[PDB]
Structure formats: C-alpha cells, structure tokens
C-alpha cells in the first residue's frame, strides 16, 4: 500500500517479454462485465494462455515492436479505449473471439448507459398490486389496471440501440425483472503476424 | 329518549350532546360559515369565467327557459327550486350531455359531472372504479376523513 514501486519500467519489462512470447495479441474491454463474470472468463483464457497489465503502460507496444520488426506508429489509429487489457495467447484469432464474444455472462442494463441493442418490454401481468402505475406510463410503457393487477398493454420498444437509457427507465425495468445483454471481454482488436484486424 | 317538546328536542339535537344519557353522540358540532369567516380575495381569475347566453330546452311536454347569467372563477353557485323545474336539465346542458333547443354553450372547459339519481350501471367493483378515476385523491388525508374511515 505504501510508496515503494508500484513499479515503473519493471512491470513494463515483464510486459515487454509477454507480447514477444506469444503470437496472438488482443486488445479487450472489461468495462461492462462483473468480476465473477470477468474472473471466470479469465479462468478459461488462463489454462490456454494469459492476460497482463497496463495504462498507457500498455501503450508501449511500440517498445515491443521496436525490439522486433513488426509495427510502430504504423498501426491505423491505436485502437485503445477506456477500460482496455491485453490477451497474449497461442490461440488463433477466430477461436478467441468465439470463446469470449459467444460466452458472456448474463447481467442487467444500467441507468445512463447507452443501450447496445434494442430494448423491448412485453405485454402481460406484472403481477403487482395497485400503486404507482404512473411511473411506467412516464417512460412510454402503456399500462393500465386489469383484474386489480398492473398489466403492460402491449409490446413496444422503450429504447433503441445507440440511445441512452434514462435513470427512471433502467430502475423500472429492473423491478419488472427484465434484463437481457451479454457481458464479457468486448474484443476491440487483434494482432497476428503483421496484420491488424478490427471488430 | 323520553318524549320531549318540539322546540326543545330540536335544540338538544343540534348541541350534539344529551345530558341524562351523557353522551356526545356527534364528534363535532355543526357550524355554518358566517360569511365574515370566508377568505377575502379579489376574484376573477382569468377575468371571470365562462358565460352562457339565454338557453331553452323544450321536450315538447315541458319547456325550460334560462336567463343569461355569468359565472366567475373560484365561485360556487347553488341551484334551488322544485323538481320538474328543469334544474336537472340545466346542469346537463352545461355538461354537454344535452343539446339545447335554442341557445348554445360550447365551452373550452373540461367538466366533471355527478348525476342526481344514482343507479349502478357499471360493471366492476367499487375500488376498481374509483382508482380508474384517480388514485392519489385516495391517498389524501381529506379523503380519509370524509370517505374511507367513516363508512369503511
């Protein structure tokens, strides 16, 4: 916890040898995914070959590149985004994506997050007794009281992909028990053998 | 109670208390506002409310005549008279339920109306019906005092 490194140039130095040891290098997104979910996802990778560290200490692929003859500089626009890791692997490119991208860990949306895909809510009885039905109506979910229970009138899209989910919107959906997205290591890039693959 | 005089029995009734029995039969005494008691405001709101012209509604067996009057905002108007006078007819016209034979009253206003003789003709239970109209009015403390707690 104290001041002692918290290393600089030392952890970079371990990291240096790690791009060079493995053929295939991935630029990946934790941000969304819980850590029982990440930590489990990482368990899979770890048997096969392993993931290591950085900030901008990550962006220093250049030093690694400088040791060999491979990229600089030369890359398209260094794709790194908030919340990035590097996955160093034996595992060929195509398979790594199918493990990570296909098998994501369940999870519910969040308030103030941009929806990744279209959100819908179904029609049918919520099962909930009379109360503040109004809250549902505020979002643009039609509801009315039928049989002394709150029911949603119809299926409709509450939010589209690429629009943000409002704070009210999220909370009300969670009470419904409606979630739906796939969380995991969102692949943002690949290097293998002098070649750059985007998502 | 034991038999009493006409004047006497009525007087005791209004007190809300009977001495021999020693019971306060009514929780609160009845009082009427003096008209001194009322709040003093300059009333108009938007300058006065809506106004209706002369109206007539004739069934062909009964004819109602109405003299042009004005209504103002935040006021209350009583209607009195004997039945069969078209007290009911008049209110309906203002409700827009009835169309006048002559005269017209097309107001912009939103109206709520309660009918005179109430016979049920709504399927559903009592709570469901009142909740559709408005919930939240049901939450208010005023409504607890007057409706919910007394009857149950």
From Swiss-Prot, chain A:
It comes from Saccharomyces cerevisiae (strain ATCC 204508 / S288c) (Baker's yeast). The modification Phosphoserine is found at residue 68. This is Large ribosomal subunit protein uL10. GO terms for cellular component: 90S preribosome; cytoplasm; cytosolic large ribosomal subunit. Component of the ribosome, a large ribonucleoprotein complex responsible for the synthesis of proteins in the cell. The small ribosomal subunit (SSU) binds messenger RNAs (mRNAs) and translates the encoded message by selecting cognate aminoacyl-transfer RNA (tRNA) molecules. The large subunit (LSU) contains the ribosomal catalytic site termed the peptidyl transferase center (PTC), which catalyzes the formation of peptide bonds, thereby polymerizing the amino acids delivered by tRNAs into a polypeptide chain. GO terms for molecular function: large ribosomal subunit rRNA binding; structural constituent of ribosome. It comes from the Eukaryota. There is a cross-link at residues 14, 97, 144 (Glycyl lysine isopeptide (Lys-Gly) (interchain with G-Cter in ubiquitin)). It is found in: Cytoplasm. The keyword S-adenosyl-L-methionine does not apply. The chain holds residues 1 to 199 of 312 of the full protein. GO terms for biological process: cytoplasmic translation; ribosomal large subunit assembly. Keywords: Cytoplasm, Isopeptide bond, Phosphoprotein, Ribonucleoprotein, Ribosomal protein, Ubl conjugation. Component of the large ribosomal subunit (LSU). Mature yeast ribosomes consist of a small (40S) and a large (60S) subunit. The 40S small subunit contains 1 molecule of ribosomal RNA (18S rRNA) and 33 different proteins (encoded by 57 genes). The large 60S subunit contains 3 rRNA molecules (25S, 5.8S and 5S rRNA) and 46 different proteins (encoded by 81 genes). The 5 acidic ribosomal P-proteins form the stalk structure of the 60S subunit. They are organized as a pentameric complex in which uL10/P0 interacts with 2 heterodimers, P1A-P2B and P1B-P2A. uL10 directly interacts with 28S rRNA. The gene is RPP0. Belongs to the universal ribosomal protein uL10 family.
From Swiss-Prot, chain B:
ATP binds at residues 81-88. It comes from Saccharomyces cerevisiae (strain ATCC 204508 / S288c). Component of the multifactor complex (MFC) composed of at least RLI1, the eIF2 subunit SUI2, TIF5/eIF5, and the eIF3 subunits PRT1, HCR1, NIP1, RPG1, TIF34 and TIF35. The complex associates with pre-initiation complexes. Interacts with the complex YAE1:LTO1; the complex bridges the interaction between the CIA complex and RLI1. Present with 6280 molecules/cell in log phase SD medium. Belongs to the ABC transporter superfamily. ABCE family. The chain holds residues 305 to 456 of 608 of the full protein. This is Translation initiation factor RLI1. The modification Phosphoserine is found at residue 45. Component of the multifactor complex (MFC) involved in translation initiation. Required for the binding of MFC to the 40S ribosome. Required for the processing and nuclear export of the 60S and 40S ribosomal subunits. It comes from the Eukaryota. It is found in: Cytoplasm; Nucleus.
